[PDB]
mmCIF file of all heavy atoms in Angstrom:
data_model
loop_
_atom_site.group_PDB
_atom_site.id
_atom_site.type_symbol
_atom_site.label_atom_id
_atom_site.label_comp_id
_atom_site.label_asym_id
_atom_site.label_seq_id
_atom_site.Cartn_x
_atom_site.Cartn_y
_atom_site.Cartn_z
ATOM 1 N N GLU A 12 0.854 -1.193 0.038
ATOM 2 C CA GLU A 12 0.042 0.010 0.009
ATOM 3 C C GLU A 12 0.857 1.245 -0.017
ATOM 4 O O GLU A 12 0.565 2.280 -0.669
ATOM 5 C CB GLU A 12 -0.958 0.023 1.213
ATOM 6 C CG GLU A 12 -1.585 1.349 1.499
ATOM 7 C CD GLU A 12 -2.407 1.853 0.333
ATOM 8 O OE1 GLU A 12 -2.783 0.959 -0.528
ATOM 9 O OE2 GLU A 12 -2.750 3.010 0.266
ATOM 10 N N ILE A 13 1.932 1.240 0.727
ATOM 11 C CA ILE A 13 2.860 2.364 0.812
ATOM 12 C C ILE A 13 3.506 2.572 -0.530
ATOM 13 O O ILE A 13 3.682 3.632 -1.095
ATOM 14 C CB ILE A 13 3.970 2.165 1.918
ATOM 15 C CG1 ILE A 13 3.279 2.196 3.283
ATOM 16 C CG2 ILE A 13 4.956 3.220 1.808
ATOM 17 C CD1 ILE A 13 4.186 2.082 4.393
ATOM 18 N N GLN A 14 3.895 1.438 -1.173
ATOM 19 C CA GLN A 14 4.419 1.494 -2.572
ATOM 20 C C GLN A 14 3.419 2.127 -3.528
ATOM 21 O O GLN A 14 3.788 2.814 -4.470
ATOM 22 C CB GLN A 14 4.877 0.112 -3.010
ATOM 23 C CG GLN A 14 5.814 -0.597 -2.041
ATOM 24 C CD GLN A 14 6.790 -1.548 -2.694
ATOM 25 O OE1 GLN A 14 7.509 -1.179 -3.636
ATOM 26 N NE2 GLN A 14 6.782 -2.795 -2.181
ATOM 27 N N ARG A 15 2.159 1.702 -3.364
ATOM 28 C CA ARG A 15 1.156 2.268 -4.229
ATOM 29 C C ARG A 15 0.949 3.736 -4.072
ATOM 30 O O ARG A 15 0.703 4.545 -4.915
ATOM 31 C CB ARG A 15 -0.195 1.547 -3.960
ATOM 32 C CG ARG A 15 -1.208 1.537 -5.134
ATOM 33 C CD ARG A 15 -2.153 0.408 -4.989
ATOM 34 N NE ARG A 15 -1.624 -0.858 -4.699
ATOM 35 C CZ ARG A 15 -1.822 -1.683 -3.653
ATOM 36 N NH1 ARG A 15 -2.627 -1.225 -2.672
ATOM 37 N NH2 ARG A 15 -1.217 -2.821 -3.494
ATOM 38 N N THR A 16 1.034 4.204 -2.798
ATOM 39 C CA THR A 16 1.027 5.653 -2.517
ATOM 40 C C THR A 16 2.213 6.361 -3.176
ATOM 41 O O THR A 16 1.969 7.399 -3.822
ATOM 42 C CB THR A 16 1.066 5.952 -0.987
ATOM 43 O OG1 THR A 16 -0.023 5.211 -0.360
ATOM 44 C CG2 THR A 16 0.967 7.417 -0.681
ATOM 45 N N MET A 17 3.393 5.805 -3.116
ATOM 46 C CA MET A 17 4.541 6.344 -3.795
ATOM 47 C C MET A 17 4.316 6.428 -5.257
ATOM 48 O O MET A 17 4.753 7.386 -5.964
ATOM 49 C CB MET A 17 5.838 5.583 -3.437
ATOM 50 C CG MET A 17 6.989 5.907 -4.264
ATOM 51 S SD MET A 17 8.186 4.582 -4.410
ATOM 52 C CE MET A 17 8.117 3.934 -2.724
ATOM 53 N N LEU A 18 3.768 5.276 -5.824
ATOM 54 C CA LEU A 18 3.478 5.219 -7.185
ATOM 55 C C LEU A 18 2.491 6.303 -7.706
ATOM 56 O O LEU A 18 2.633 6.948 -8.724
ATOM 57 C CB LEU A 18 2.936 3.771 -7.725
ATOM 58 C CG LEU A 18 4.026 2.797 -7.846
ATOM 59 C CD1 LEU A 18 3.460 1.470 -8.229
ATOM 60 C CD2 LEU A 18 5.055 3.229 -8.878
ATOM 61 N N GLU A 19 1.441 6.542 -6.916
ATOM 62 C CA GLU A 19 0.484 7.631 -7.224
ATOM 63 C C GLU A 19 1.256 8.970 -7.203
ATOM 64 O O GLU A 19 0.980 9.780 -8.002
ATOM 65 C CB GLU A 19 -0.613 7.535 -6.197
ATOM 66 C CG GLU A 19 -1.756 8.555 -6.525
ATOM 67 C CD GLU A 19 -2.068 8.681 -8.031
ATOM 68 O OE1 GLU A 19 -2.412 7.720 -8.636
ATOM 69 O OE2 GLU A 19 -1.859 9.750 -8.569
ATOM 70 N N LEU A 20 2.074 9.192 -6.181
ATOM 71 C CA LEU A 20 2.842 10.421 -6.118
ATOM 72 C C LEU A 20 3.698 10.576 -7.379
ATOM 73 O O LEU A 20 3.642 11.690 -7.925
ATOM 74 C CB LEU A 20 3.743 10.353 -4.853
ATOM 75 C CG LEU A 20 4.466 11.647 -4.436
ATOM 76 C CD1 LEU A 20 5.666 11.926 -5.389
ATOM 77 C CD2 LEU A 20 3.509 12.828 -4.441
ATOM 78 N N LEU A 21 4.370 9.598 -7.788
ATOM 79 C CA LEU A 21 5.257 9.782 -8.932
ATOM 80 C C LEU A 21 4.553 9.826 -10.209
ATOM 81 O O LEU A 21 5.005 10.375 -11.283
ATOM 82 C CB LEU A 21 6.269 8.618 -8.977
ATOM 83 C CG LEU A 21 5.884 7.217 -8.792
ATOM 84 C CD1 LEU A 21 5.126 6.734 -10.084
ATOM 85 C CD2 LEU A 21 7.038 6.328 -8.482
ATOM 86 N N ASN A 22 3.248 9.272 -10.283
ATOM 87 C CA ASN A 22 2.422 9.464 -11.399
ATOM 88 C C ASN A 22 1.913 10.865 -11.501
ATOM 89 O O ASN A 22 1.815 11.506 -12.603
ATOM 90 C CB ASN A 22 1.316 8.418 -11.385
ATOM 91 C CG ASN A 22 0.368 8.514 -12.603
ATOM 92 O OD1 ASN A 22 -0.001 9.572 -13.008
ATOM 93 N ND2 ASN A 22 0.110 7.312 -13.112
ATOM 94 N N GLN A 23 1.508 11.405 -10.384
ATOM 95 C CA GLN A 23 1.116 12.882 -10.352
ATOM 96 C C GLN A 23 2.188 13.777 -10.702
ATOM 97 O O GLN A 23 2.010 14.689 -11.512
ATOM 98 C CB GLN A 23 0.493 13.155 -8.970
ATOM 99 C CG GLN A 23 -0.902 12.780 -8.750
ATOM 100 C CD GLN A 23 -1.878 13.279 -9.737
ATOM 101 O OE1 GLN A 23 -1.717 14.403 -10.058
ATOM 102 N NE2 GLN A 23 -2.798 12.473 -10.268
ATOM 103 N N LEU A 24 3.451 13.512 -10.314
ATOM 104 C CA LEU A 24 4.561 14.463 -10.438
ATOM 105 C C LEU A 24 4.897 14.522 -11.909
ATOM 106 O O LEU A 24 4.993 15.605 -12.500
ATOM 107 C CB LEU A 24 5.818 13.990 -9.639
ATOM 108 C CG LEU A 24 5.871 14.639 -8.212
ATOM 109 C CD1 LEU A 24 7.065 14.025 -7.456
ATOM 110 C CD2 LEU A 24 5.993 16.122 -8.356
ATOM 111 N N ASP A 25 5.151 13.414 -12.584
ATOM 112 C CA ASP A 25 5.499 13.366 -14.003
ATOM 113 C C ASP A 25 4.989 12.070 -14.637
ATOM 114 O O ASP A 25 5.570 11.021 -14.541
ATOM 115 C CB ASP A 25 7.053 13.486 -14.165
ATOM 116 C CG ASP A 25 7.552 13.280 -15.562
ATOM 117 O OD1 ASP A 25 6.777 12.755 -16.454
ATOM 118 O OD2 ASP A 25 8.691 13.686 -15.816
ATOM 119 N N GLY A 26 3.868 12.181 -15.277
ATOM 120 C CA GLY A 26 3.209 11.043 -15.933
ATOM 121 C C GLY A 26 2.252 11.565 -16.982
ATOM 122 O O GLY A 26 2.459 12.746 -17.440
ATOM 123 N N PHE A 27 1.337 10.741 -17.422
ATOM 124 C CA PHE A 27 0.325 11.128 -18.304
ATOM 125 C C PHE A 27 -0.404 12.403 -17.743
ATOM 126 O O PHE A 27 -0.728 12.473 -16.518
ATOM 127 C CB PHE A 27 -0.750 9.949 -18.532
ATOM 128 C CG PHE A 27 -1.441 10.031 -19.875
ATOM 129 C CD1 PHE A 27 -0.948 9.152 -20.934
ATOM 130 C CD2 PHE A 27 -2.341 10.910 -20.156
ATOM 131 C CE1 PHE A 27 -1.537 9.131 -22.125
ATOM 132 C CE2 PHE A 27 -2.932 10.966 -21.413
ATOM 133 C CZ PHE A 27 -2.535 10.110 -22.342
ATOM 134 N N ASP A 28 -0.623 13.356 -18.658
ATOM 135 C CA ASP A 28 -1.100 14.660 -18.285
ATOM 136 C C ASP A 28 0.054 15.421 -17.655
ATOM 137 O O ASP A 28 0.794 14.952 -16.806
ATOM 138 C CB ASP A 28 -2.347 14.572 -17.362
ATOM 139 C CG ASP A 28 -3.256 13.497 -17.732
ATOM 140 O OD1 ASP A 28 -3.723 13.444 -18.875
ATOM 141 O OD2 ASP A 28 -3.608 12.683 -16.844
ATOM 142 N N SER A 29 0.114 16.725 -17.943
ATOM 143 C CA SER A 29 1.164 17.578 -17.349
ATOM 144 C C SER A 29 0.715 17.878 -15.900
ATOM 145 O O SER A 29 -0.363 17.861 -15.513
ATOM 146 C CB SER A 29 1.236 18.946 -18.121
ATOM 147 O OG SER A 29 -0.036 19.424 -18.473
ATOM 148 N N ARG A 30 1.800 18.236 -15.090
ATOM 149 C CA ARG A 30 1.616 18.455 -13.659
ATOM 150 C C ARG A 30 1.060 19.802 -13.428
ATOM 151 O O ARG A 30 0.541 20.132 -12.367
ATOM 152 C CB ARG A 30 2.933 18.326 -12.926
ATOM 153 C CG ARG A 30 2.822 18.514 -11.412
ATOM 154 C CD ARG A 30 4.070 18.206 -10.740
ATOM 155 N NE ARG A 30 5.244 18.633 -11.511
ATOM 156 C CZ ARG A 30 6.399 18.848 -10.929
ATOM 157 N NH1 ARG A 30 6.695 18.715 -9.664
ATOM 158 N NH2 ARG A 30 7.472 19.159 -11.722
ATOM 159 N N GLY A 31 1.116 20.759 -14.400
ATOM 160 C CA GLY A 31 0.645 22.092 -14.149
ATOM 161 C C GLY A 31 1.764 22.947 -13.493
ATOM 162 O O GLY A 31 2.931 22.522 -13.417
ATOM 163 N N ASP A 32 1.282 24.072 -12.976
ATOM 164 C CA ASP A 32 2.302 24.962 -12.252
ATOM 165 C C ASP A 32 2.277 24.744 -10.768
ATOM 166 O O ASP A 32 2.048 25.531 -9.928
ATOM 167 C CB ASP A 32 1.894 26.413 -12.474
ATOM 168 C CG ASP A 32 3.041 27.322 -12.522
ATOM 169 O OD1 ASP A 32 4.032 27.000 -11.862
ATOM 170 O OD2 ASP A 32 2.933 28.455 -13.123
ATOM 171 N N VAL A 33 2.687 23.445 -10.367
ATOM 172 C CA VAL A 33 2.878 23.047 -8.960
ATOM 173 C C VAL A 33 4.361 22.631 -8.851
ATOM 174 O O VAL A 33 4.743 21.727 -9.588
ATOM 175 C CB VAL A 33 1.875 21.979 -8.511
ATOM 176 C CG1 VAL A 33 0.472 22.362 -8.989
ATOM 177 C CG2 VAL A 33 2.240 20.630 -9.105
ATOM 178 N N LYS A 34 5.028 23.201 -7.946
ATOM 179 C CA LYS A 34 6.420 22.856 -7.589
ATOM 180 C C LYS A 34 6.462 22.082 -6.369
ATOM 181 O O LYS A 34 5.884 22.369 -5.367
ATOM 182 C CB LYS A 34 7.293 24.091 -7.554
ATOM 183 C CG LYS A 34 7.375 24.887 -8.848
ATOM 184 C CD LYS A 34 7.375 26.367 -8.646
ATOM 185 C CE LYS A 34 6.969 27.122 -9.912
ATOM 186 N NZ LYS A 34 7.878 26.756 -11.010
ATOM 187 N N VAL A 35 7.299 21.020 -6.348
ATOM 188 C CA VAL A 35 7.458 20.061 -5.235
ATOM 189 C C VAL A 35 8.768 20.188 -4.648
ATOM 190 O O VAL A 35 9.789 20.050 -5.323
ATOM 191 C CB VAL A 35 7.147 18.668 -5.707
ATOM 192 C CG1 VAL A 35 7.487 17.600 -4.608
ATOM 193 C CG2 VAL A 35 5.752 18.450 -6.086
ATOM 194 N N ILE A 36 8.830 20.430 -3.344
ATOM 195 C CA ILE A 36 10.074 20.481 -2.567
ATOM 196 C C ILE A 36 10.032 19.341 -1.608
ATOM 197 O O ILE A 36 9.037 19.131 -0.797
ATOM 198 C CB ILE A 36 10.226 21.772 -1.803
ATOM 199 C CG1 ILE A 36 9.918 23.002 -2.755
ATOM 200 C CG2 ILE A 36 11.654 21.929 -1.259
ATOM 201 C CD1 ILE A 36 10.195 24.304 -2.219
ATOM 202 N N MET A 37 11.052 18.454 -1.531
ATOM 203 C CA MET A 37 11.153 17.316 -0.662
ATOM 204 C C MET A 37 12.434 17.337 0.111
ATOM 205 O O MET A 37 13.442 17.850 -0.299
ATOM 206 C CB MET A 37 11.108 16.006 -1.488
ATOM 207 C CG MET A 37 10.419 16.219 -2.806
ATOM 208 S SD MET A 37 10.507 14.690 -3.851
ATOM 209 C CE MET A 37 9.332 13.697 -3.092
ATOM 210 N N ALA A 38 12.392 16.988 1.359
ATOM 211 C CA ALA A 38 13.533 16.853 2.238
ATOM 212 C C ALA A 38 13.747 15.477 2.705
ATOM 213 O O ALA A 38 12.754 14.669 3.067
ATOM 214 C CB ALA A 38 13.380 17.815 3.472
ATOM 215 N N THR A 39 14.972 15.038 2.823
ATOM 216 C CA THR A 39 15.347 13.686 3.259
ATOM 217 C C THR A 39 16.714 13.709 3.840
ATOM 218 O O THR A 39 17.638 14.304 3.250
ATOM 219 C CB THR A 39 15.186 12.683 2.070
ATOM 220 O OG1 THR A 39 15.615 11.439 2.589
ATOM 221 C CG2 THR A 39 15.988 13.118 0.842
ATOM 222 N N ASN A 40 16.904 13.137 4.988
ATOM 223 C CA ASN A 40 18.328 12.923 5.596
ATOM 224 C C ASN A 40 18.881 11.663 5.075
ATOM 225 O O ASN A 40 19.771 11.186 5.692
ATOM 226 C CB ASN A 40 18.240 12.933 7.162
ATOM 227 C CG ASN A 40 16.886 13.482 7.747
ATOM 228 O OD1 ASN A 40 16.224 14.320 7.129
ATOM 229 N ND2 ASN A 40 16.436 12.883 8.795
ATOM 230 N N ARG A 41 18.217 11.163 4.027
ATOM 231 C CA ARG A 41 18.643 9.845 3.511
ATOM 232 C C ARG A 41 18.215 9.751 2.032
ATOM 233 O O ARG A 41 17.101 9.252 1.735
ATOM 234 C CB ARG A 41 18.001 8.702 4.271
ATOM 235 C CG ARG A 41 18.952 8.099 5.384
ATOM 236 C CD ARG A 41 18.200 7.910 6.609
ATOM 237 N NE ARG A 41 17.711 6.448 6.756
ATOM 238 C CZ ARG A 41 18.510 5.492 6.919
ATOM 239 N NH1 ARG A 41 19.852 5.632 7.136
ATOM 240 N NH2 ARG A 41 18.020 4.176 6.952
ATOM 241 N N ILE A 42 19.133 10.160 1.091
ATOM 242 C CA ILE A 42 18.654 10.130 -0.302
ATOM 243 C C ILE A 42 18.982 8.792 -1.016
ATOM 244 O O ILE A 42 18.401 8.494 -2.134
ATOM 245 C CB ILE A 42 19.242 11.297 -1.081
ATOM 246 C CG1 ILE A 42 18.476 11.568 -2.403
ATOM 247 C CG2 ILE A 42 20.685 11.175 -1.368
ATOM 248 C CD1 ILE A 42 18.781 12.871 -3.123
ATOM 249 N N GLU A 43 19.949 8.020 -0.444
ATOM 250 C CA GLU A 43 20.362 6.818 -0.969
ATOM 251 C C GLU A 43 19.176 5.693 -0.882
ATOM 252 O O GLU A 43 19.300 4.722 -1.634
ATOM 253 C CB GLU A 43 21.632 6.263 -0.365
ATOM 254 C CG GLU A 43 21.430 5.629 1.039
ATOM 255 C CD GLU A 43 21.614 6.720 2.107
ATOM 256 O OE1 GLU A 43 21.897 7.819 1.828
ATOM 257 O OE2 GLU A 43 21.451 6.280 3.333
ATOM 258 N N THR A 44 18.245 5.932 -0.028
ATOM 259 C CA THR A 44 17.161 5.044 0.097
ATOM 260 C C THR A 44 15.848 5.382 -0.656
ATOM 261 O O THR A 44 14.911 4.607 -0.360
ATOM 262 C CB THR A 44 16.919 4.867 1.667
ATOM 263 O OG1 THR A 44 16.138 6.054 2.099
ATOM 264 C CG2 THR A 44 18.152 4.704 2.468
ATOM 265 N N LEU A 45 15.873 6.397 -1.369
ATOM 266 C CA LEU A 45 14.766 6.768 -2.123
ATOM 267 C C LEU A 45 14.672 6.058 -3.502
ATOM 268 O O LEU A 45 15.665 5.712 -4.141
ATOM 269 C CB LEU A 45 14.702 8.293 -2.419
ATOM 270 C CG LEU A 45 14.301 9.186 -1.202
ATOM 271 C CD1 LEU A 45 14.012 10.596 -1.721
ATOM 272 C CD2 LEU A 45 13.147 8.535 -0.500
ATOM 273 N N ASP A 46 13.411 5.816 -3.997
ATOM 274 C CA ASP A 46 13.265 5.128 -5.184
ATOM 275 C C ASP A 46 13.758 5.942 -6.350
ATOM 276 O O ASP A 46 13.579 7.138 -6.376
ATOM 277 C CB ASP A 46 11.709 4.915 -5.374
ATOM 278 C CG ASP A 46 11.340 4.606 -6.879
ATOM 279 O OD1 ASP A 46 12.127 4.581 -7.760
ATOM 280 O OD2 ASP A 46 10.140 4.359 -7.083
ATOM 281 N N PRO A 47 14.605 5.334 -7.194
ATOM 282 C CA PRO A 47 15.284 6.070 -8.258
ATOM 283 C C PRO A 47 14.260 6.851 -9.142
ATOM 284 O O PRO A 47 14.553 7.998 -9.625
ATOM 285 C CB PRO A 47 16.021 5.026 -9.062
ATOM 286 C CG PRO A 47 16.234 3.919 -8.105
ATOM 287 C CD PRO A 47 15.007 3.926 -7.231
ATOM 288 N N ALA A 48 13.091 6.299 -9.349
ATOM 289 C CA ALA A 48 12.091 7.009 -10.113
ATOM 290 C C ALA A 48 11.623 8.326 -9.562
ATOM 291 O O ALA A 48 11.417 9.248 -10.295
ATOM 292 C CB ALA A 48 10.905 6.050 -10.392
#
């Protein structure tokens, strides 16, 4: 389910249909553990 939430996030960010004029800022004290997509 968490993976599905991540997939929905990455589909909204850059997928079918443009994202529009919304900018996403993310913070992580661990970038090596993030999904490459």
Side-chain angles (χ1 to χ4, degrees):
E12 166 60 20
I13 295 183
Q14 307 208 56
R15 210 161 303 123
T16 306
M17 173 206 320
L18 278 180
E19 187 38 61
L20 188 286
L21 48 72
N22 183 313
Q23 280 302 316
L24 267 177
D25 171 344
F27 210 102
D28 320 308
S29 41
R30 182 172 39 160
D32 208 339
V33 313
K34 294 142 201 303
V35 171
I36 315 187
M37 338 174 74
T39 175
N40 346 325
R41 261 140 96 74
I42 195 171
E43 77 266 1
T44 74
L45 283 195
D46 161 356

